Amino acid sequence: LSAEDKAAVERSKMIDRNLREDGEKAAREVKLLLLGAGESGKSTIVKQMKIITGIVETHFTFKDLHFKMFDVGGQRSERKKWIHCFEGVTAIIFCVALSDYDLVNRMHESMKLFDSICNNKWFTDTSIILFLNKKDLFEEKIKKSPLTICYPEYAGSNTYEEAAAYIQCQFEDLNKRKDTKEIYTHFTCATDTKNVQFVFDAVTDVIIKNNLKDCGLF
Template sequence: LREDDTQNRMKESILLFDEICNSPWFKDTTFMLFLNKTDLFREKIPRVPLTVCFPDYSGENNYEQGTSFIKQQFLDTRNFNQKIYHHYTCAISTENVKFVFGAVKDTLLDGTLDTFLL
């Protein structure tokens, strides 16, 4: 996917996620969705309505409702019944990155144990 400055990056990301999730090659794959730059989103959402990107958005312009709506846009793309774990991340926050990668490690370990019925 080549970056195109004329396209909305959020919509491009959702389309790419849709293509990958709904590929027959990945129909039984567990996905991890990282919604990054939460710090920038938290700053921007009070100033720029989410309807700029999503005209059908009817929630409030706040962090909680906005992130929930965006997460759901990604989850609604799947046609198969894959597990999708999501994490809100701020890559410049060391504590957040440690927490998220700890959660990812636990998720991967649980999945591996389930696979081998341990």
């Protein structure tokens, strides 16, 4: 037996060890997914996230740790047949704009888009994070036209603290499952450090919860 199989199993083992030592390098790094809307805010939040067709990755670094952003909006097709291929990710970013309420049912379209991702059968473990862009641009929106244009079922004041909190309250009360994942929300800013650092901390909490998923302390 094993005429030249003693040299064939050597090739069978070399590029099998290569698969292991190349898969560990891709499995130890953390991945962050990015949904959004139609050209809403996925260009402003990637101004800091730049560097070290279909979908294109974004491989930047922060505190000597490489992140991989996976865009979605480049796919001009349906979502029912490839959203299961993007599982195993740590954090899903769902960037939402605020100044698109007047143009038409755009904010009402983003609510049922947020509803389809929080009740997905494949994303029942990955925690989702939503941004709220145009923080300074939404402050001048209320004095011309309030938020109560197409809301007869809700009454409130015309202050900026009430308008920014009700959008955060309406998005958070959409998930049917509340035990596993926890929706995070952060208003953006014009700075560079505090725009991503909370997101940094957010990913930290997820892995801590993932460790509480591992030790059984959850």
